[PDB]
Amino acid sequence: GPSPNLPPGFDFTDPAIYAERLPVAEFAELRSAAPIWWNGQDPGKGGGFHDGGFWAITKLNDVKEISRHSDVFSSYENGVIPRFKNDIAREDIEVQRFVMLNMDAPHHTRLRKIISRGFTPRAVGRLHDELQERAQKIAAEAAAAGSGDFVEQVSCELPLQAIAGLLGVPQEDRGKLFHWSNEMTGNEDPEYAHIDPKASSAELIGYAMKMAEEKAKNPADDIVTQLIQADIDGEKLSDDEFGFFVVMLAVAGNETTRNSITQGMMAFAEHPDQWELYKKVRPETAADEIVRWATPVTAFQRTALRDYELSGVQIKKGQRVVMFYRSANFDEEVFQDPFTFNILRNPNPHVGFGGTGAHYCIGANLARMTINLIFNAVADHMPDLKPISAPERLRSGWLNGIKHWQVDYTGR
Numbered sequence: 001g002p003s004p005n006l007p008p009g010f011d012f013t014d015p016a017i018y019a020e021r022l023p024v025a026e027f028a029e030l031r032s033a034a035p036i037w038w039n040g041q042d043p044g045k046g047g048g049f050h051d052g053g054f055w056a057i058t059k060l061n062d063v064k065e066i067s068r069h070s071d072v073f074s075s076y077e078n079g080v081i082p083r084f085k086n087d088i089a090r091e092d093i094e095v096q097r098f099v100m101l102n103m104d105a106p107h108h109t110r111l112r113k114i115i116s117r118g119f120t121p122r123a124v125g126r127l128h129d130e131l132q133e134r135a136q137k138i139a140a141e142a143a144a145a146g147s148g149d150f151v152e153q154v155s156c157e158l159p160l161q162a163i164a165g166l167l168g169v170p171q172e173d174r175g176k177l178f179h180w181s182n183e184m185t186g187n188e189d190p191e192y193a194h195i196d197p198k199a200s201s202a203e204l205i206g207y208a209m210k211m212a213e214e215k216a217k218n219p220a221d222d223i224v225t226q227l228i229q230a231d232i233d234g235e236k237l238s239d240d241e242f243g244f245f246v247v248m249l250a251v252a253g254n255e256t257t258r259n260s261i262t263q264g265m266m267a268f269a270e271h272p273d274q275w276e277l278y279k280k281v282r283p284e285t286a287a288d289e290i291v292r293w294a295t296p297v298t299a300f301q302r303t304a305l306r307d308y309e310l311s312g313v314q315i316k317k318g319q320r321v322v323m324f325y326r327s328a329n330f331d332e333e334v335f336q337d338p339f340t341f342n343i344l345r346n347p348n349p350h351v352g353f354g355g356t357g358a359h360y361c362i363g364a365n366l367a368r369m370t371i372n373l374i375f376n377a378v379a380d381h382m383p384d385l386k387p388i389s390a391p392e393r394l395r396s397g398w399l400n401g402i403k404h405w406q407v408d409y410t411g412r
């Protein structure tokens, strides 16, 4: 059929778009007119990838199919982040293969099995009470300030405290853990142009390996002991493997949940009936509707290891496919009224945590609990908050971020 009505040369991973807006109309145009569409990229404008473009995947069923067929669609070959600075060295992309997110089976299979020790329901549930207490304190302190930056005073802290609590990081070290985590992402935004993710990753690996050594001597009931204690088959994370795990967690556990909270509250400010309902019932289905609406990871990619026909399109060996979760989470064929913010939506089969498959987010229930606890605390302590000015969006080609959002917590 006809080509999609998009500006010539439009690139759905272009950070300059996301610094201003989410390209919602553009995604909808692809879902209607070219649900799998070749996103060409000019020389030097591939965000670190120099292969001429990628297949934009905009339908949820296609995202699920790619995610399920990890034997064909590789995370390791080019990593899963679809956009870096245009001049990033290839070697700096490949160094990402040392975290489980960017590995294929069988290496991924072994690590995921080991790490599952640290994300058991029980391990995560043991954090409930401390995170609830921290959430109430966070909201109380924010409301006492009267007004300020919702991103910094409400959204930022609890995700970091969850990481710290899961890993058993001493309180006196959480400041520097928080700093390292915040130095990893956003380096294409002018506000964060001076961050040094490679240096922070090295400091965190050094910190983490020291912790692994210490926790081997004196086991504490965090996840670390489960991760570095050999099982019957001698399987365990080496000290450097634990280091790479902490790097992965410090990044994965921070800004995505933060941006879920900020954009969830933006959604409530735009939909007062849902906010009144939330305050009255406190439905935990709200967390999944918040993640669907926020889709904090706009997109992750894969690379075909062989020719593969996907919904009538011939994917060729070596080509990248980019799963636009932001499009799939508003797929009219899966969601009733996807553009209605409905905190009771149930079932809510969004792919904000990825598609079902080998790499499905291991932190999903930790994220959902963080979100439910903080919105309860917001409803308890600042039920009448009112935005003061527009949010400032993050310049990124794959993360949907809010840097700042001024709100009046007392709403007067």
Ligand code: HEM
Residues within 6 Å of the ligand: 067, 075, 080, 100, 101, 102, 112, 163, 248, 249, 252, 253, 254, 256, 257, 260, 291, 295, 296, 297, 300, 351, 352, 353, 354, 355, 358, 359, 360, 361, 362, 363, 364, 366, 367
């Ligand atoms: C709302 C918050 C979050 C969102 C939107 C999110 C999103 C995602 C997505 C899309 C994936 C899919 C990877 C893929 O298919 O290539 C994923 C995987 C993963 N997530 Fe999350 N995530 C969130 C919170 C967290 C948290 C809190 C943690 C840990 C504390 C975490 C740890 C991970 C890990 C380790 C993986 C890789 C799993 C593997 O490769 O086997 N995430 N996440």
Ligand SMILES: COc1ccc(CNc2ccc(Cc3ccncc3)cc2)cc1
Residues within 6 Å of the ligand: 081, 095, 096, 097, 098, 099, 101, 198, 201, 247, 248, 251, 252, 253, 256, 297, 361
């Ligand atoms: C130098 O060592 C390294 C190794 C790997 C990495 C990148 N790892 C990474 C990439 C993307 C995300 C985003 C995400 C958020 C929530 N859930 C899942 C994924 C998290 C971690 C950097 C430096």
Ligand SMILES: [Cl-]
Residues within 6 Å of the ligand: 336, 337, 340, 342, 345
């Ligand atoms: Cl609905």
